[PDB]
Amino acid sequence: VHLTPEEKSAVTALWGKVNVDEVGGEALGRLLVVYPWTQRFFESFGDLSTPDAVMGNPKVKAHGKKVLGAFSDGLAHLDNLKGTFATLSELHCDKLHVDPENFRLLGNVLVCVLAHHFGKEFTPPVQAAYQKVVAGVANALAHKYH
Amino acid sequence: VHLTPEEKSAVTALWGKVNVDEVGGEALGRLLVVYPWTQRFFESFGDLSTPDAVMGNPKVKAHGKKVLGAFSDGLAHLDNLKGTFATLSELHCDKLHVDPENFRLLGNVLVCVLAHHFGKEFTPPVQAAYQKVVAGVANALAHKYH
Amino acid sequence: MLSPADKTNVKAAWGKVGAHAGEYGAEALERMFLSFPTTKTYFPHFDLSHGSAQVKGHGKKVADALTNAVAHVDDMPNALSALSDLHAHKARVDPVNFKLLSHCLLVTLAAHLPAEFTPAVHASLDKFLASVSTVLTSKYR
Amino acid sequence: MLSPADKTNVKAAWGKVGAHAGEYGAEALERMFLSFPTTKTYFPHFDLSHGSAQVKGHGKKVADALTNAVAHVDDMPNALSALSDLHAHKARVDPVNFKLLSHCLLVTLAAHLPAEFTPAVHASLDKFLASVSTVLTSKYR
Ligand code: HEM
Numbered sequence: 001v002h003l004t005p006e007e008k009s010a011v012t013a014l015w016g017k018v019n020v021d022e023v024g025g026e027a028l029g030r031l032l033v034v035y036p037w038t039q040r041f042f043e044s045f046g047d048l049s050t051p052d053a054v055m056g057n058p059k060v061k062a063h064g065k066k067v068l069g070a071f072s073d074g075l076a077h078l079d080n081l082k083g084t085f086a087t088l089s090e091l092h093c094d095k096l097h098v099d100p101e102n103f104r105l106l107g108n109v110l111v112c113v114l115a116h117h118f119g120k121e122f123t124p125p126v127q128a129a130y131q132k133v134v135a136g137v138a139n140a141l142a143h144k145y146h
Numbered sequence: 147v148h149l150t151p152e153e154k155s156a157v158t159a160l161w162g163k164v165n166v167d168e169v170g171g172e173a174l175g176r177l178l179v180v181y182p183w184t185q186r187f188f189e190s191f192g193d194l195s196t197p198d199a200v201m202g203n204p205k206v207k208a209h210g211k212k213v214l215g216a217f218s219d220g221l222a223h224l225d226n227l228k229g230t231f232a233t234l235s236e237l238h239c240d241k242l243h244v245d246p247e248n249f250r251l252l253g254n255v256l257v258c259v260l261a262h263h264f265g266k267e268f269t270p271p272v273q274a275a276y277q278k279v280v281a282g283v284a285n286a287l288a289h290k291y292h
Numbered sequence: 293m294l295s296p297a298d299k300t301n302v303k304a305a306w307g308k309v310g311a312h313a314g315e316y317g318a319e320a321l322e323r324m325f326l327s328f329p330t331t332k333t334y335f336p337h338f339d340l341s342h343g344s345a346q347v348k349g350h351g352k353k354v355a356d357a358l359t360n361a362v363a364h365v366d367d368m369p370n371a372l373s374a375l376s377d378l379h380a381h382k383a384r385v386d387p388v389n390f391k392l393l394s395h396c397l398l399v400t401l402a403a404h405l406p407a408e409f410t411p412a413v414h415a416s417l418d419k420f421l422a423s424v425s426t427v428l429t430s431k432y433r
Numbered sequence: 434m435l436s437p438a439d440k441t442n443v444k445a446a447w448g449k450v451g452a453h454a455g456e457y458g459a460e461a462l463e464r465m466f467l468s469f470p471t472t473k474t475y476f477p478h479f480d481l482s483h484g485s486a487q488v489k490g491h492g493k494k495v496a497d498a499l500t501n502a503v504a505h506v507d508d509m510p511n512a513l514s515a516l517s518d519l520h521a522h523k524a525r526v527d528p529v530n531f532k533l534l535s536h537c538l539l540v541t542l543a544a545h546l547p548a549e550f551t552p553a554v555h556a557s558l559d560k561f562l563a564s565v566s567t568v569l570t571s572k573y574r
């Protein structure tokens with residue numbers, strides 16, 4: 001991205017230990033809870049009335065896994081997040097009407113979840129590298145907005 | 147920047163009408179007045195206690211001219227802002243310790259100044275081109291921070 | 293918080309806006325759409341074409357609300373309660389967008405009120421738009 | 434505005450921090466300096482190297498103030514008056530930076546209080562830091 005070989009390794013290696021299923025469901029649920037206004041795009045999901053109700057909602061969990069999935073696949077194209085998310089970028093703009101700021105909120109939520117999960121392992125230098133990736137991904141996703 | 151040719155012409159046409167000496171002083175003065183926190187960098191400039199003190203301070207006026215001078219040069223190398231601004235970026239970071247957010251504030255202030263001065267000539271779309279430009283300069287100026 | 297000075301400044305500049313508030317509201321919207329295109333994601337249901345009646349209609353609504361905040365400068369939280377509720381519960385506009393509108397509102401005024409748009413008035417107006425924004429976003433979570 | 438649940442959530446979470454608050458203060462700063470290198474512009478006079486006593490000491494200071502704020506969750510404006518002064522008139526840190534330190538503080542708590550960092554607590558702490566930020570930047574202009 002602007003990732004140092006060292007920073008590249010750090011990202012790469014931690015990720016390999018990530019359960020996308022769980023992390024994706026948690027990142028997305030936390031987002032809906034911490035920043036309630038993001039719920040505006042998930043009306044059809046159901047009961048998001050409570051933390052408990054969000055975290056439990058399977059429509060939420062499954063959406064989380066799909067999001068982290070695509071995110072996960074993007075880490076394989078760290079040299080071209082732009083080309084990797086071009087179509088996803090147009091979709092979010094043109095079909096979903098998702099404000100790119102949301103990409104930023106999730107990124108940050110994602111980082112809190114990783115810290116939550118890896119405690120010790122998620123060091124300042126490892127956070128720094130992840131911060132550059134979430135920023136990078138959000139930028140790529142926002143790229144085709146017009 | 148992501149400036150269409152017609153955006154680049156519009157930037158250039160208007161900029162031809164600007165009195166960099168005057169706009170420089172106005173933009174810098176207004177910045178110290180609207181966001182008083184920005185005054186932290188100019189305690190050697192003297193009296194900045196009131197709007198009149200700021201707007202009329204010979205030091206603020208002179209500095210503003212210097213800043214817009216550097217900016218005008220930037221407008222002739224719109225293709226290589228990072229290049230153009232590299233030594234300045236290094237200076238602001240390493241010597242001056244100026245938080246890059248200052249560069250975005252100034253960009254916004256400058257856009258209001260252009261609006262102020264050109265009235266109706268500062269059309270919605272001319273503003274959109276200048277927005278792209280001030281953002282590019284701000285980014286260029288922050289590129290060497292570390 | 294707004295000082296007595298600020299209040300005088302705002303009533304004065306807004307006073308001049310007068311019967312043009314509507315048109316200025318509309319213009320501010322258009323400038324925002326062109327400069328910060330991401331803001332369009334909130335108006336998927338609008339004709340955002342140049343001279344859209346929708347935009348025109350929307351501009352008046354925003355202007356009327358601002359006019360209402362000036363009229364109740366000593367009780368904005370209450371004068372704007374309803375709109376605070378709407379934005380928090382239905383529209384759910386992300387906070388950062390408020391600063392984009394504010395900015396475009398400042399540009400429009402500057403472009404229309406050269407004589408009143410002094411440094412001091414500029415500052416007062418900025419603090420004002422920030423306050424309105426804070427209110428509209430106060431019930432978000 | 435912090436709800437009763439929020440205040441509770443916060444007091445619980447911070448309760449657990451205990452004797453480690455200073456350490457967490459320090460770690461958050463360290464994470465901030467590395468993740469958002471622009472924040473270093475306000476500490477030219479510090480040794481920003483890992484485990485620097487200046488950073489350590491500053492970490493303590495920040496933690497203690499946070500503590501004081503939890504204790505006066507009800508009277509923040511008043512409990513942090515002096516601090517709002519200092520930041521507004523002396524330090525003059527740009528407001529964008531408060532969000533960066535806040536985030537780094539969450540990350541730190543997450544990493545150290547796994548069991549206690551539930552979604553509901555995560556939400557409360559965020560709102561809390563937002564409130565603290567608001568207070569610390571309220572006298573800027
Ligand atoms: C890491 C950033 C993100 C990635 C990689 C991503 C990716 C995806 C993918 C792969 C889909 C599947 C839909 C399809 O392919 O037809 C999707 C749908 C969607 N995303 Fe995003 N997304 C991201 C962030 C967000 C955020 C933050 C929000 C809102 C808070 C959001 C809102 C939506 C919505 C509303 C849909 C449609 C789901 C449906 O059809 O029910 N996305 N996204």
Ligand code: HEM
Pocket residue numbers: 184187188212213214216217234238242244248249252283287
């Ligand atoms: C458009 C963005 C800017 C440009 C092109 C610019 C350009 C310049 C130039 C050419 C100099 C003199 C260099 C030298 O001394 O060798 C300078 C100095 C300086 N600039 Fe920037 N500047 C910009 C924005 C800012 C902002 C927004 C601030 C603070 C809020 C700032 C703070 C300073 C300070 C404190 C100095 C040194 C003054 C002194 O001589 O004591 N600059 N700038």
Ligand code: HEM
Pocket residue numbers: 331334335353354355357358375378379383385389390391393424425428
């Ligand atoms: C201080 C600034 C703002 C003011 C005074 C304001 C005021 C209003 C008012 C008066 C309405 C109409 C409510 C009604 O139907 O009675 C409205 C609706 C709306 N606003 Fe806000 N607003 C502001 C900021 C924003 C921002 C920044 C955005 C997004 C970029 C936004 C998005 C919307 C949307 C999408 C609607 C609904 C429009 C419709 O479907 O008719 N607002 N606002």
Ligand code: HEM
Pocket residue numbers: 472475476491494495498499516520524526530531532534535565566569
């Ligand atoms: C979470 C919100 C914050 C709190 C509670 C806080 C609290 C404090 C405290 C307790 C002090 C020391 C006062 C003393 O020495 O008596 C301080 C000083 C300082 N703070 Fe803030 N702070 C916060 C956010 C920030 C941020 C985000 C920055 C910059 C990125 C910052 C920059 C500074 C600086 C530069 C000093 C002076 C350090 C020195 O010279 O020793 N603060 N702050």
